[PDB]
Symmetry: C5
């Protein structure tokens, strides 16, 4: 029954005592802010610069003793999004940020609801490039935790205290998949605090859990390396008399192992601690290098026989045959038990982390 | 007959009851928005980050009971584009966005038309970087669907409902070609809806269909691999006595197949599910590896004959000749039937998707 | 004799009837805009994303029946560049754009002149990243045409019509050279038109012509490939008895041809139609592959002779010598006539396009 | 007891004599600014463009004779962050900058405190891309110093003088680690000054110390090179009669050393002075090249014996055996004493810098 | 003695006749602007896109007949940097620009001084990405000249004329070094002019001189190539009987020369004119190719002897020995005189440019 313009002008205006630069219920208890997180599109995680791009909606609810009309017959009112510089929006920033621009397509992407009691709604979609300090102890499994710290800036703990919600904590979009990782539906959340030299500031956070969807690294690194140890066993199944071919084969296998190994760490950023992949590459490289060394020893034994050329002649030839046959038998069992030990210790550490 | 300035000042002014912060025909039925899409320049699709750049014009028409002059002798009026903060433009955003800036060259790229009844026009060219979740089950064919979701932000389903148009749905520019794909002239379109925890919001979308213009991947991957299996058949047409040359040829072919294979997946982003190209590379690699293995077996048989050096001698030589000739015959027929089976199953799946 | 401030305040002010939001000589004939283009710095053309960066000055002249003082003793007046929001600048955009920011260093880069009759001047330097749909039928020659479409946005053909100039059409900077291309001094220009669903809009364009300054591609691709066919002729001038060396040489040449070929298309964006360079690479690859095949055939003939080891013995040896000598003679003449045919068909198509 | 709005309006208003465009206690002594630095997230250092990204909080305190209410019962007051254009914030810039944008997420990231005496607080989080002129005399150790120069712009030394703090100088975040370097807890700090042609300006700086967390460069460069000298010693443990194999092995090792060496300097920017890594690569390359040269000399001696083929025959064979055995003994001791000398001179220079 | 606010309000205000939109001493002589350049941080020159990043301070002084208080006892006054839209700053732009943003960290980076006579100061730090058309006739020496053209925009030669200074022309920062180049302390400067179709505009410029600090290109390109010609001389010091090894060595050296050569031009942008480095690579490639050719000729001579196998036999063997020994002697003297001729013509052209 009353004109909409008149109601809007009177409320949050200059003819009333509403001042947008001061905290409501001044000089008393702090105001509680209830935040909810709707993840719109997770993805584009950078593993070389330790960051990821995510756009949240950041809806926050609080109560004020003012702006309580209590005269309209409905429960809540929808206000226009171009009158947000008089609603006293609270302060909120992220402790790990890079850029973090707004969204201004067609019209401003703000929202502002107001009810009879004073519980408001304020959600703004913002694209964040949050930096996460991921620890990469083992590269193939790569269990990871990503955070974000909602924290005030200029309002202490005894001035403004933030809180989470109970009906739903962190919501995700329906049908949201990632090509690198998969999202865990546990959504571990708690909150820390900050102690600077100016006062005690609140800082609420939330943790995510992302594990690697295996199958890429098996074809890029594990499958080619296997085709190299089989190549060295192929060098074991060849005639000893021929010097050119064998030598070339051993050398070529070693070179490929080095190139591959190198190229495997290119995507990864410079790190000091040895990785799981490095251990695998070193073991393979050792096997191929050992094969080459075994050939040099056999060649030397045969050469010694040639230089000294009855019973010792046959003994040397027999020794060369025996070492080659025992190397052909011994090499796949040690590699198979290394493969079994390696995958069983990494599957139990994948279950344990 | 009446002064233009006076008419402009009176309409959408402060001496009248027009308030730009409130929805027209308040507390009643919702207002319908009729949207049209003119694609100006499609292209620059990113296959490694799953996005594409497109600039639409976004013309939207709606009706209001106000701004109905009904006193000028013409049907419609052209207003200046610097008076858009009083025309109550509705809210519209895209659910998949990255950046999405405006266009401000020379003068603002807005448009605003107004007729006697109140049907307005509002088109703004905006460059969008829309993220599309493309599924790459088979890489060479790469059938793809790209979308965009027009959705309100702050107006529920019972407050503002969007709709499409009937005279033309999504228009494209005349003579618009893409180097990677080709545009399908079907333009499949329908609309979903959104259900958040704050209310029911409308969400209108449109789907495109882009198929790969084949001919690039045939020269980059298929043509070189063929020149590798012919190389292994060349190794089959060589004398068995010579150990260096053959060994080197087999090894070299295998190495090229691995390098090529690796480099072929560099453009593609990290994915878990095996691709069609990977299957082709594996089959080729297997053929060349098998050739190498066949040579090792022949070499071993010949060596056995050498170590034991009448009727068994001839039998061993005959066996070596027989295995080489049957391998030279058997290898191109298995590769030819694999090529026929591979291309016929991919052409029937290209017709089926 | 009259105060400058008073004259400025009265003209394009609120005490006069000048309204900046309305077109001059309203409800009558359209106003003609005379545009000139001064290219400041052409360059930075992107061949992988089909675009180029150019900064024009965009001076445009038009006439209005208002702003005709006719009281100062000079012909024209220079106004300050911070009073451009009251001069009714017309609308102009480009149909192919990416970014296209302004220039704001020290002071605004605008210009505004006004004469006694009303012919104004308005030039603004803007850096444009225009997208051009270049067709690359033949890569080395790469004849190209680049455009830019000046078009209004909100003013129809019967409301505002653009035109070019007659004293000079498109000016270039003195001493402007490009490292990739060279500018043609013809400057072909004409104008198209646009027909959308809202009305008939004017669209004026201009075409440039850029041809490749040859000498880069001759050293990067043509010179190394020649040094590969000479390498295969070197393999032809070697003894047939030696199996290792020859085989290795043939294989190595083939591998280099493949690597080179691959790497040559890296700069170029993904395209479907076969290029001129690809044809050259294929022909060279065929020659080297053929050489390898020729060796395998000779080796096989010699091996047959070895297995059967009087008159047929000499005949086989003679045949091996004859095939090698005829291959050594036949191979440079076919390659020389291919080189002559290839360069004469590309020089006549370079003269014809 | 007094209304908050009235107090805010009167203070830093137009009804009082507070002018925000003039320095407090004008025409007298300069005002001292006490700055503190809280490092929020150090990291993303660029070693190829000599820069690093760091976000500081920049809290600065100063005193003014105005804004001394002395009427509220508390010690300090918290003001709103949207009234900062009337508090006369001082001027501060950085002498080495690239970009250096602000932070505007949800609400402005400013802070403003005011006490009864007039000591204010003003902290703003700003992401800085500071350029540091790092000297890379030795690449593996890479001891580095990073700075930042806080300096005024428009206020001379006798007008505004900056100072540091005594209770804490430069604070770091709790649990801040870097993947490339490690932060030194000394935090060396002092201050320089500037003398331009316009006056004497103050310039306060702070220096950091970052040393390389070793373990990356040991696996990427040192470990593969060792596996190359062992490869050349493998070539020393092979029969001299065989010419193909040995030659190939020597050549292959030399080629890998060159490729590796090249690729090792790719990350590093173009520099003129020789690096420590280059010295190591050159020494290794020399050892492998020397091995190859040793083989050529032995081959030549054996060939001479072949061409001349009693007592000199045996003497030549004996000489070939003696040179090979003495090269097999002499080569690992010279490489081991080079390794000992190299690591002991670099560990004493790592302790000395 | 007079209030600072009153003086500031009266001067450059609306109660006086000062108009910021008009040139001082109107309709008379032009105003002279004295510019000085302080280079803060030179560096980050791009050799592939022909540009460089430099931040200047751009202090400019001019005189006006207005703003002459002549009532304060000091010589000059310091004004606040937030009142620059009323001081009539002149127009200045750069003819070669890319981006060229401002600097806004903490407070605006402007400066404004005003004396009793009217000589003002105005310095603004701006980061410029100036495009320079460098000519690369010889790549290792790479003598270069970089410019920047200060020019007005909207004020003709008879309206506003710019000038340089006499006490210092272009100042550099103390201790400013570059990793790629070194700065010449000559600072050649003069000024051109512009003649467009609208009038005569002033354009003042300054030229820098940057020469290459040699030592990078000697290790990346010159040192590896030498280790390739020594490798071909190693192939000359080997036994002719062995066909595999030699052939492989020749081929490998040629391949490395090609790969290296290619990779050397990767950093450089596409250019047509042959470079000095290309000439060096071609000469080296020719020497290694020639060595390979020499071997083929010797092999052919030996083969001819084998096919014909008394006095001609010895003569052929003697000829093979003579050609090998004369090639081993002749090859290092031609390469040494080429090295001497090459470095003496480039050191005299380095002294001449
Ligand atoms: C939400 O705010 C209310 C007041 O605005 C807080 O209630 C006060 O909390 C303190 C600490 O427990 C008590 O000493 C007061 O007596 C409470 N006030 C009243 C009126 O009961 C409340 O703690 C806040 N909620 C949370 C979760 O902290
Ligand atoms: C366009 O808007 C009109 C009203 O503005 C809608 O018409 C109403 O629709 C509801 C639902 O069907 C009916 O119950 C009402 O009776 C309609 N009003 C009238 C006056 O007839 C209409 O539905 C909208 N168009 C679309 C496609 O939804
Ligand atoms: C420039 O504008 C004038 C009017 O502003 C145009 O002149 C009119 O053109 C139409 C079409 O030929 C004629 O029917 C009218 O009679 C013309 N008016 C007058 C007063 O002669 C003119 O065509 C425009 N110039 C161009 C090149 O289109
Ligand atoms: C802080 O500021 C005060 C004044 O605002 C400075 O005190 C003056 O310093 C000069 C130089 O030593 C003396 O000659 C004056 O007598 C001092 N004034 C008074 C009232 O004592 C002080 O130096 C500044 N602090 C620092 C560290 O420079
Ligand atoms: C600086 O400006 C003054 C005037 O503002 C210029 O002086 C005039 O120059 C012209 C050309 O030489 C003479 O014809 C006038 O007579 C000069 N005026 C006076 C009052 O002497 C002066 O040329 C400018 N400086 C420079 C270097 O051009």
């Amino acid at each position: 029954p009353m004109p909409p313009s008149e109601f809007l002008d009177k409320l949050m205006g200059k003819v009333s005592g509403y001042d947008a630069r001061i905290r409501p219920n001044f000089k008393g208890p702090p105001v509680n802010v209830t935040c909810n997180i709707f993840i719109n599109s997770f993805g584009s995680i950078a593993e070389t610069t330790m960051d990821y791009r995510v756009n949240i909606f950041l809806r926050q609810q609080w109560n004020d003793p003012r702006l309580a009309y209590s005269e309209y017959p409905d429960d809540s009112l929808d206000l226009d999004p171009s009158m947000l510089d008089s609603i006293w929006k609270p302060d909120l920033f992220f402790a790990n940020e890079k850029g973090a621009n707004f969204h201004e397509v067609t019209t401003d992407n703000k929202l502002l609801r107001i009810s009879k009691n004073g519980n408001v709604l304020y959600s703004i979609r913002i694209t964040l490039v949050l930096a996460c300090p991921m620890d990469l102890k083992n590269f193939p499994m790569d269990v990871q935790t990503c955070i974000m710290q909602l924290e005030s800036f200029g309002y202490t703990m005894n001035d403004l205290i933030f809180e989470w919600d109970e009906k739903g904590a962190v919501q995700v979009a329906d049908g949201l998949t990632l090509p690198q990782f998969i999202l865990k539906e546990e959504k571990d959340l708690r909150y820390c605090t900050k102690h600077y030299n100016t006062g005690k500031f609140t800082c609420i956070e939330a943790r995510f859990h992302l594990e690697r969807q295996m199958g890429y690294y098996l074809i890029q690194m594990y499958i080619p390396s296997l085709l190299i140890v089989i190549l060295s066993w192929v060098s074991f199944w060849i005639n000893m008399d021929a010097a050119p071919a064998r030598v070339g084969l051993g050398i070529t296998t070693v070179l490929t192992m080095t190139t591959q190994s190198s190229g495997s760490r290119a995507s990864l950023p410079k790190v000091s601690y040895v990785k799981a992949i490095d251990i695998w590459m070193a073991v393979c490289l050792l096997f191929v290098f050992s094969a080459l060394l075994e050939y040099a020893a056999v060649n030397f034994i045969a050469r010694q026989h040639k230089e000294l050329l009855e019973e010792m002649r046959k003994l040397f030839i027999s020794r060369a045959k025996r070492i080659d046959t025992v190397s052909r038998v011994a090499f796949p069992l040690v590699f198979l038990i290394f493969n079994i030990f390696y995958w069983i210790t990494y599957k139990i550490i994948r279950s344990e982390d």
